[PDB]
Subunit: 340 residues, 2 copies
């Protein structure tokens, strides 16, 4: 009972997540690595009260993010080194309360309302629904876009590699972020052209990324709203981390728009995370699924529920593969859907 | 690489403790033990959306508070069982967001502001400082008092048993809550009289506990302000979980009020969690210490800091006894201070 009780207190504790997040937000690990080892030197770098900073560091040592090397000198463990801003998993940014995702997590403080009503909680804190908030704040939009694309150059290699492109001439990436998926497809399949459809602000950052990668002649970027008719037909339409943002009714409206723009013999590729229901009681499914509830009113769906959504949009799930992230301990799902 | 990343993401996660706290708030484990094992029966008992509730339950399973046995039927594990309302540790009530402490913990969402300023963040969220907020909400005043005295009949036995009451005729328990400590001393040392000094609301609940226990004529309760001169003198003056509510300058003011109210040969007893600084880098010390920062601008003090604080009030630390805790695994100490 002693071990059970401390297991519960730990899982229940709010100060630990918040200590990690403030350390990230304060750039503590970066500052230690640049030579500020002592509490007083870190206090000066972060403009904090030395005694308050010492109390925060005390907890960071307790939970294994920092350790003492010499008297009053602290140093990141291997876990703490992950908060270095140049680390490829970009966990410092992802835990930064000033950036879009960690800021969105304050939504979890009203979790009971979400479970009670099934509605997102984000608006009640920040005054606008998620995407209107990002649109009314271009600096948060930019942050959000860079977080989801922190991984861009490798995150889409695997799903692109899992799909055969022989029967594809044009690709439409609906809600395609900074153009990473489209880029990965282009590099792997020289005969394919692509169009990325996105919202304002994001479109310019997608163009600029594609120009940097030397793919502007092969990948086009267009501003648009994916609830309206899509501007182009395609042999392959990608919905990567889109459908999970939306409740069922809207997710079907999106799938239906995609189905309607499908060229004969076409397919849509859903890239996000699913599970068979019996295998869904795990931390990777729930962590993202609950973010979707509270940020947006969206959801991860089970393999079984995907049969239902697919059918309501005039589609069938042809096959589901699961694929590992190259950056982070997380599996993704690639679902290929065919017209009925 | 893989394991460091997953360790970091777990530690950084806000959704887990909020999931625990809303399960506690919804009385989920109680409803299960009373016969409601399905999401359907639980959603009806808790007035939540079935589909949203299933998603909460899915995470309660992944982190190991619940498991399925029969198809669609859930039961608490060894760890989930601790959220039963009548469990001795009372962890359900301590994680209930309608009760004072878990409500107060939302203050951790602004931990960066607390590290910068050394000041509480509670008022920035709820509109008044901690004790002024309780003073205007009898709802929270009462739940706070019951949380702190959830252990009332045993928590003060050890420290009461640990002090020598032979030369003590009167005891002043400054900020004594419901009067538990005073009662345990009365029982153990029948020759003693005691006075509990407390705030409005708490004074009624202290008299009512002492009357039910039959000790009205041996322990009287006084409404008062321990920053003002204390209403009486005494041979032992108790500060049990008081000084930690206050920054150095206020704690010295209180210690000095106590020193002025001492009779010749009298001692003041501080009942509180402490630690040698070199041993303070542990989860027991930081969890309570950061709560005091963020709720109240208070602090746990180390053994070394206690010497400085006592000296500022014209006192020395004459001895410290270590105390085993008979409810939750959480070491405490009884410090005995005399005039220097
Ligand atoms: C720690 C796990 C994860 O990183 C997983 C996933 O991120 C995946 C896919 C990203 N991508 C391409 C969008 C990126 O490759 C990242 C490294 O892994 C992901 C993730 O994909 C998203 C979020 C995450 O937190 C995460 C992270 C998570 O679940 O932490 C609890 C969002 O918060 C989020 C918020 C609002 C809208 C969103 O949809 C576009 C997302 C979102 O897609
Ligand atoms: C989980 C461990 C603990 O409960 C330990 C401690 O409580 C101790 C002493 C209590 N007592 C004698 C008054 C009681 O017996 C409790 C069961 O254990 C304690 C604790 O003592 C307090 C708090 C805790 O969370 C805890 C707990 C904790 O560290 O959670 C992270 C407060 O939040 C708190 C808030 C505002 C004012 C406060 O003081 C008047 C407290 C406080 O004293
Ligand atoms: N009505 C709408 N029309 C077009 N895009 C929308 C939209 N609502 C949201 N989106 C977009 O869809 C995206 C989801 S997130 C980025 C997903 C990206 N394909 C990736 O996997 O990394 C956002 O970039 C956002 O701009
Ligand atoms: N100005 C003041 N005057 C008298 N009591 C105060 C006070 N400000 C706060 N307090 C109190 O001191 C108590 C701290 S809680 C500790 C209660 C008890 N000694 C125990 O060990 O459980 C609270 O109950 C609160 O009412």
């Amino acid at each position: 009972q002693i071990d059970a009780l401390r297991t519960l207190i730990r899982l229940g504790s709010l100060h630990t997540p918040m200590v990690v997040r403030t350390a990230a937000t304060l750039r503590l690990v970066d500052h230690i690595l640049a030579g500020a080892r002592t509490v007083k030197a870190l206090a000066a770098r972060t403009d904090t009260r030395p005694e308050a900073l010492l109390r925060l560091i005390r907890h960071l040592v307790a939970i294994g993010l920092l350790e003492e090397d010499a008297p009053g000198e602290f140093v990141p463990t291997e876990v703490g080194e992950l908060l270095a801003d140049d680390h490829p998993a970009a966990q410092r940014a992802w835990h930064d309360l000033t950036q879009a995702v960690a800021r969105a997590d304050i939504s979890f403080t009203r979790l009971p309302d979400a479970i009670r009503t099934g509605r997102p909680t984000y608006e009640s804190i920040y005054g606008k629904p998620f995407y209107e908030d990002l649109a009314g704040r271009p600096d948060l939009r930019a942050s959000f876009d860079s977080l989801l694309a922190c991984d861009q150059d490798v995150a889409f290699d695997a799903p692109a590699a899992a799909y055969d492109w022989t029967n594809v001439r044009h690709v439409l990436d609906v809600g395609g972020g900074k153009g990473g998926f489209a880029a990965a497809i282009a590099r792997r399949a020289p005969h394919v052209s692509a169009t990325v459809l996105e919202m304002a602000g994001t479109v310019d950052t997608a163009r600029s990324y594609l120009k940097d990668e030397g793919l502007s002649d092969r990948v086009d970027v267009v501003e648009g709203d994916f609830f309206e008719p899509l501007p182009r037909k395609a042999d392959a339409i990608i919905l990567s981390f889109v459908l999970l943002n939306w409740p069922d009714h809207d997710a079907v409206r999106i799938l239906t728009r995609c189905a309607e723009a499908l060229e004969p013999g076409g397919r849509i590729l859903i890239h996000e995370r699913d599970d068979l229901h019996e295998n869904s009681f795990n931390e990777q499914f729930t962590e993202l699924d609950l973010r979707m509830l509270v940020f947006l009113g969206g959801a991860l769906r089970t393999r079984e529920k995907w049969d239902g959504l697919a059918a309501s949009a005039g589609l069938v799930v042809e096959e589901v593969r699961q694929l590992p992230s190259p950056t982070i301990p997380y599996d993704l799902s690639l679902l290929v859907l065919a017209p009925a």
